[PDB]
Design an enzyme around this catalytic site. Structure first.
Site, PDB file in Angstrom:
ATOM      1  N   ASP A 314       0.846  -1.182   0.000  1.00 15.79           N
ATOM      2  CA  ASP A 314       0.000   0.000   0.000  1.00 15.79           C
ATOM      3  C   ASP A 314       0.880   1.229   0.000  1.00 15.79           C
ATOM      4  O   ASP A 314       1.719   1.406   0.884  1.00 15.79           O
ATOM      5  CB  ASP A 314      -0.926   0.015   1.226  1.00 15.79           C
ATOM      6  CG  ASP A 314      -1.648   1.320   1.289  1.00 15.79           C
ATOM      7  OD1 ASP A 314      -0.884   2.276   1.890  1.00 15.79           O
ATOM      8  OD2 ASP A 314      -2.940   1.607   1.054  1.00 15.79           O
ATOM      9  N   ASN A 322      -2.113  13.035  -4.672  1.00 15.33           N
ATOM     10  CA  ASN A 322      -3.191  13.415  -5.584  1.00 15.33           C
ATOM     11  C   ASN A 322      -3.762  14.813  -5.279  1.00 15.33           C
ATOM     12  O   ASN A 322      -4.172  15.538  -6.182  1.00 15.33           O
ATOM     13  CB  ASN A 322      -4.331  12.388  -5.518  1.00 15.33           C
ATOM     14  CG  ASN A 322      -4.179  11.260  -6.508  1.00 15.33           C
ATOM     15  OD1 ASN A 322      -3.367  11.299  -7.424  1.00 15.33           O
ATOM     16  ND2 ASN A 322      -5.005  10.253  -6.343  1.00 15.33           N
ATOM     17  N   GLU A 357      -4.861   2.187  -4.728  1.00 12.94           N
ATOM     18  CA  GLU A 357      -3.482   2.447  -4.346  1.00 12.94           C
ATOM     19  C   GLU A 357      -2.804   1.184  -3.756  1.00 12.94           C
ATOM     20  O   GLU A 357      -1.815   1.278  -3.016  1.00 12.94           O
ATOM     21  CB  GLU A 357      -3.449   3.601  -3.326  1.00 12.94           C
ATOM     22  CG  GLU A 357      -4.109   3.245  -1.958  1.00 12.94           C
ATOM     23  CD  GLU A 357      -4.165   4.404  -0.923  1.00 12.94           C
ATOM     24  OE1 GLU A 357      -3.271   4.450  -0.023  1.00 12.94           O
ATOM     25  OE2 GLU A 357      -5.111   5.247  -0.986  1.00 12.94           O
TER      26      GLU A 357
HETATM   27  N1  C2E Z   1     -17.273   2.813  -7.918  1.00 16.18           N
HETATM   28  C1  C2E Z   1     -16.365   3.775  -7.677  1.00 16.18           C
HETATM   29  N2  C2E Z   1     -15.794   3.861  -6.444  1.00 16.18           N
HETATM   30  C2  C2E Z   1     -14.881   4.827  -6.242  1.00 16.18           C
HETATM   31  C3  C2E Z   1     -14.543   5.702  -7.268  1.00 16.18           C
HETATM   32  N3  C2E Z   1     -13.621   6.566  -6.820  1.00 16.18           N
HETATM   33  C4  C2E Z   1     -13.378   6.224  -5.533  1.00 16.18           C
HETATM   34  N4  C2E Z   1     -14.160   5.183  -5.193  1.00 16.18           N
HETATM   35  C5  C2E Z   1     -14.152   4.497  -3.897  1.00 16.18           C
HETATM   36  O1  C2E Z   1     -13.830   5.397  -2.830  1.00 16.18           O
HETATM   37  C6  C2E Z   1     -12.532   5.135  -2.302  1.00 16.18           C
HETATM   38  C7  C2E Z   1     -11.810   6.448  -2.148  1.00 16.18           C
HETATM   39  O2  C2E Z   1     -11.775   7.164  -3.384  1.00 16.18           O
HETATM   40  P1  C2E Z   1     -10.838   8.493  -3.419  1.00 16.18           P
HETATM   41  O3  C2E Z   1     -11.459   9.475  -2.458  1.00 16.18           O
HETATM   42  O4  C2E Z   1     -10.738   8.929  -4.876  1.00 16.18           O
HETATM   43  O5  C2E Z   1      -9.366   8.120  -2.870  1.00 16.18           O
HETATM   44  C8  C2E Z   1      -8.725   7.149  -3.760  1.00 16.18           C
HETATM   45  C9  C2E Z   1      -7.904   7.762  -4.884  1.00 16.18           C
HETATM   46  O6  C2E Z   1      -7.396   9.046  -4.473  1.00 16.18           O
HETATM   47  C10 C2E Z   1      -6.742   6.799  -5.143  1.00 16.18           C
HETATM   48  N5  C2E Z   1      -6.975   6.038  -6.407  1.00 16.18           N
HETATM   49  C11 C2E Z   1      -7.740   4.967  -6.678  1.00 16.18           C
HETATM   50  N6  C2E Z   1      -7.705   4.681  -8.026  1.00 16.18           N
HETATM   51  C12 C2E Z   1      -6.896   5.589  -8.582  1.00 16.18           C
HETATM   52  C13 C2E Z   1      -6.453   5.829  -9.872  1.00 16.18           C
HETATM   53  O7  C2E Z   1      -6.817   5.083 -10.823  1.00 16.18           O
HETATM   54  N7  C2E Z   1      -5.627   6.881 -10.096  1.00 16.18           N
HETATM   55  C14 C2E Z   1      -5.230   7.681  -9.093  1.00 16.18           C
HETATM   56  N8  C2E Z   1      -4.393   8.732  -9.330  1.00 16.18           N
HETATM   57  N9  C2E Z   1      -5.669   7.485  -7.834  1.00 16.18           N
HETATM   58  C15 C2E Z   1      -6.466   6.441  -7.566  1.00 16.18           C
HETATM   59  O8  C2E Z   1      -6.663   5.993  -3.986  1.00 16.18           O
HETATM   60  C16 C2E Z   1      -7.676   6.309  -3.029  1.00 16.18           C
HETATM   61  C17 C2E Z   1      -8.192   4.978  -2.511  1.00 16.18           C
HETATM   62  O9  C2E Z   1      -8.776   4.321  -3.638  1.00 16.18           O
HETATM   63  P2  C2E Z   1      -9.631   2.978  -3.406  1.00 16.18           P
HETATM   64  O10 C2E Z   1      -8.615   2.237  -2.549  1.00 16.18           O
HETATM   65  O11 C2E Z   1     -10.101   2.462  -4.772  1.00 16.18           O
HETATM   66  O12 C2E Z   1     -10.919   3.327  -2.512  1.00 16.18           O
HETATM   67  C18 C2E Z   1     -11.827   4.183  -3.262  1.00 16.18           C
HETATM   68  C19 C2E Z   1     -12.998   3.518  -4.009  1.00 16.18           C
HETATM   69  O13 C2E Z   1     -13.465   2.297  -3.452  1.00 16.18           O
HETATM   70  C20 C2E Z   1     -15.145   5.578  -8.498  1.00 16.18           C
HETATM   71  O14 C2E Z   1     -14.822   6.389  -9.394  1.00 16.18           O
HETATM   72  N10 C2E Z   1     -16.054   4.605  -8.686  1.00 16.18           N
HETATM   73 MG    MG Z   2      -6.687   1.127  -2.464  1.00 21.16          MG
END
Ligand code: C2E
Ligand code: MG
Ligand code: C2E
Ligand code: C2E
Ligand code: C2E
Ligand code: C2E
Ligand code: BEF
Ligand code: BEF
Ligand code: MG
Ligand code: MG
Lengths: 441, 458
Positions: A314, A322, A357
């Site tokens: 992690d 971000n 992440e």
């Molecule tokens: N269905 C759906 N659920 C969503 C979406 N965006 C966020 N979530 C849910 O909300 C959690 C936190 O999103 P975050 O605030 O963007 O905070 C996120 C985000 O800042 C980053 N992250 C996740 N995927 C990406 C990515 O593809 N690119 C980048 N730069 N950051 C990512 O890591 C943090 C934790 O991500 P997760 O562990 O996936 O845990 C995510 C995810 O389960 C979405 O667009 N669709």
């Molecule tokens: Mg994650």
């Protein structure tokens, strides 16, 4: 708001209908015979087709048969509008694939309610056909019957019984449950005495799990305001009381057919998603693929055989990144990190994108001690030399927290193995961060 | 037919609203404060939220901010309904992400037209969410829509009144890229290009704003394009008409600049949100490393892995074996039954292969009618045994074909090889399997032939 194709051999008829339609803001096109009408439909792909029956040469029933027998036009809802009122003609119409059959002179209020209904359903189908574009029969199928009129419920059940699998249910509370199972179509009595048919239908639409489920409403023909209401709340089609058996069979077929085509699109889109093995951002394998492999590896481990280890990684403070530098640079951090990972682990190992992440590495034939050593190696690696992306940003400093786990003989499962590594990650973060923490039984 | 969540601190207000809504057949749920409201929304995922602003403790603006800052609830349209009529409060409402801002006592005809409008858009966005959320759960799609915003953005202003279009374009200038167009015939063309939002004058003098918007909705290429209508505030029937033909949002004349900004932001963020979902579901379907027909890994991926495995072998370490499998008489099939059934033979065979071999093995599509399996930590004897096993499976039961209506016999010939000392190479390994295959086909067909490496006497 929709493109409507009007077909009729008397020009007076076409002009009138055109006027009414263009007055409610539809884009209307016209045709004075069958051959022309087929050509226009093939070429222009109208949202809806409104069709006379009696015409010299090719008549409306043939036109309509041909529309349905061509894959290009098959999806277009057809409405027959005709001077004919005979029951024989009505049934020949619906059997030949028309969505509805209206006898002139038409009720305008009804026509519009109906056009609006069809365009509302056509939204979801058309977007699916676009998604598929980037890359069937109506017999059988289970039909639930929600009527508290025993006798009338039985004839519907009798009629459907020959080619379908009908099931009666009068208690509406239970009918909400059964609706949630493997049902293809719901027939409701809008004129029920012990509950509100429409209200019950509204409940299904409101609920996510059943919102796409076709519903067919039995309605009092001498009550226009309630039919309109039914179409508005989301009924797929309306049957007049008393219930014509032949008409009933024809409308049920039609709905089960259109329903199955929409699941066919939804199912093709899931199948293709299932074949995709990589994560687009990073080019590693995806979670799906890793769990499939992890299942076979762990099973073979429990039946005596090669132990498997798993690393759960992690990235620390990945939001602050971000937040401060934007998501575009965040994507770059993940992309770089992915390459460091892949190149510091043997090719028999299986690194993947686990979550937003989070990353996981699967190490066949590896017990816990070696896995802790591998992890520590990877850690120092990310913390040891800065990232190319942090070069000109004197703000970045990328470290990771890692949780390590290994199979524990028979009884163990993939879920327990990843959950043990999650306890490791959790503990690594509470220590300070940038740390490796193992976790045995 | 929609689930609506009503939030207000005065019970009289909730009961009344609930009544009106249930009377038009919505499933209504309620909440008397902010914290409860957040909890319910997170838990039940309502289609629409109707929200008081003034409430003890957490107020509606904060509630609404929090709804938008959480990924779970972010997509839910919020309507603020409030005794407040001040412009300041209206702007603070729209800037905090609300879809509309209604002053009490509300016009019912308008409320319903608006709820129906939102549920009608939510159908397409909901279907794409549903496909996407499935994708994330199944473990393919990843992503973070939090990177979406409503700034930048090309805005197409379709107005007849030049002076008003200029005041509009003036105000959008600092945050966006606006472009005026007074000829409606040309505005249909421009609409078709890279445009993010259309602003139309419903009260135009030389054309019918609403008609023109209908034309966009009717046309397939522009039907999802957001449209924002400028409407005469003292004409309710024309607003309702606007929402019914498919206008995304309505602006009252005269045009408040800040309201204008806020509302344009929202509509662009929304449009971008939709595009993000479409592009997830599309980009995820692309096919880097696997073969499209069979789903096995492609030749490129296999050779990359075969290089690292064999290298590690030669430096002392785990031997690697390779199977090379060639389907017998595969042309006669394509010639007799057509290439469509030939594709089904390969597709079935691929599944028989993948399931009769351990997961740590690496089966792949090598060439047209050829497949290769890579077996780490496997010497030549075990590879011959694995090969024989696979052979008997394909020959042992016939293959389904022609829509499950015809049965067909299929044999394979296999060549087997294994790494052999510190000077071996992948090239040498595969060429040793090629010899195997050639020998098997000479023997008759449907045979396994292994080939070991040989140094010369000197
Ligand atoms: N269905 C759906 N659920 C969503 C979406 N965006 C966020 N979530 C849910 O909300 C959690 C936190 O999103 P975050 O605030 O963007 O905070 C996120 C985000 O800042 C980053 N992250 C996740 N995927 C990406 C990515 O593809 N690119 C980048 N730069 N950051 C990512 O890591 C943090 C934790 O991500 P997760 O562990 O996936 O845990 C995510 C995810 O389960 C979405 O667009 N669709
Ligand atoms: Mg994650
Ligand atoms: N430790 C251990 N695990 C066992 C044993 N038997 C079955 N399993 C596990 O159960 C799965 C199913 O075995 P299968 O039905 O024979 O289906 C098997 C079998 O058809 C074939 N296969 C793999 N290894 C061998 C083998 O050594 N001999 C034979 N004859 N077939 C094998 O590949 C299929 C899938 O292999 P897997 O993906 O590994 O998945 C295997 C493996 O994880 C065993 O004796 N010891
Ligand atoms: N699947 C997998 N297993 C891993 C990995 N890293 C370490 N191991 C396991 O941990 C053992 C000890 O690794 P080591 O302490 O670095 O001590 C290692 C290391 O010093 C050296 N060695 C082997 N391969 C390499 C290599 O590719 N690069 C470097 N720099 N040294 C290597 O030989 C020693 C003994 O090698 P082994 O007998 O194989 O025994 C290895 C191996 O079983 C890995 O990335 N993937
Ligand atoms: N400390 C340590 N690191 C490990 C170990 N196993 C893998 N790694 C790391 O992961 C990288 C990739 O190993 P590979 O993909 O199998 O590809 C490897 C492998 O095929 C071969 N190789 C290097 N050292 C040895 C070795 O000692 N024994 C064997 N049999 N092969 C080696 O050269 C390739 C590149 O080696 P590297 O440049 O070291 O790069 C290695 C190394 O940095 C290990 O046991 N200990
Ligand atoms: N990588 C890889 N290696 C393979 C595969 N099939 C066989 N082997 C190798 O061949 C050895 C003996 O195979 P066997 O004649 O099937 O004799 C096997 C077989 O009779 C049985 N067995 C083990 N796993 C399975 C299984 O999944 N399914 C079945 N049906 N039998 C199994 O146990 C015996 C001993 O197995 P091992 O000690 O594992 O030793 C195995 C293993 O090293 C394969 O698909 N992939
Ligand atoms: F000519 Be149509 F059938 F009224
Ligand atoms: F209390 Be609400 F803002 F009318
Ligand atoms: Mg006629
Ligand atoms: Mg209040």
């Amino acid at each position: 708001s929709a493109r409507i194709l009007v077909v009729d051999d008397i020009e007076a008829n076409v002009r009138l209908l055109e006027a009414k339609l263009t007055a409610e803001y539809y884009e209307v096109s016209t045709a004075m015979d069958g051959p022309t009408a087929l050509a226009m439909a093939a070429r222009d792909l109208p949202d809806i087709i409104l069709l006379d029956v009696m015409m010299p040469g090719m008549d409306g029933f043939t036109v309509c048969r041909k529309l349905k027998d061509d894959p290009t036009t098959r999806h277009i809802p057809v409405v027959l509008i005709t001077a004919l009122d005979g029951r024989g003609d009505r049934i020949q119409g619906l059997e030949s694939g028309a969505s509805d059959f209206l006898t002139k002179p038409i009720d305008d209020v009804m026509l519009f309610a109906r056009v609006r209904s069809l365009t509302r359903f056509k939204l979801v189908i058309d977007e699916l056909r676009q998604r598929e574009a980037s890359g069937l029969d109506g017999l059988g199928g289970r039909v639930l019957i929600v009527d508290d009129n025993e006798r009338q419920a039985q004839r519907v059940a009798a009629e459907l019984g020959v080619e379908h699998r009908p099931v009666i249910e009068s208690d509406p509370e239970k009918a909400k449950i059964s609706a949630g199972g493997p049902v293809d179509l719901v027939i409701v009595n809008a004129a029920a005495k012990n509950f509100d048919g429409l209200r019950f239908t509204a409940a299904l639409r409101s609920e996510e799990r059943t919102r796409q489920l076709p519903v067919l409403a039995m309605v009092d023909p001498d009550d226009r305001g309630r039919m309109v209401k039914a179409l508005e709340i989301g009924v797929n089609d309306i049957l007049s009381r008393p219930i014509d058996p032949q008409e009933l069979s024809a409308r049920v077929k039609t709905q089960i057919q259109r329903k199955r085509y929409t699941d066919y699109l939804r199912n093709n889109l899931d199948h293709s998603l299932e074949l995709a093995v990589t994560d687009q951002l990073t080019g590693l394998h995806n979670r799906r693929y890793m769990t499939g492999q992890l299942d076979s590896l762990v099973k073979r481990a429990t039946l005596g055989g090669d132990p498997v280890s798993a690393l759960l990684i992690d990235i620390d403070f990945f939001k602050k990144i971000n937040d401060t530098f934007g998501h575009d640079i965040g994507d770059e951090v993940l992309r770089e990190f992915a390459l460091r990972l892949a190149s510091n682990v043997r090719a028999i190992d299986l690194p993947c994108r686990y979550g937003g992440e989070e990353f996981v590495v699967i190490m066949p034939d590896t017990a816990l001690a070696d896995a802790l050593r591998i992890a520590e190696r990877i850690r120092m690696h990310v913390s040891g030399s800065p990232f190319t992306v942090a070069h000109g940003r004197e703000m970045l400093n990328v470290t990771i927290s890692i949780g390590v786990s290994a199979t524990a003989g028979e009884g163990d499962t993939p879920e327990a193995l990843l959950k043990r590594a999650d306890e490791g990650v959790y503990q690594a973060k509470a220590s300070g961060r940038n740390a490796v923490v193992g976790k045995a039984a």
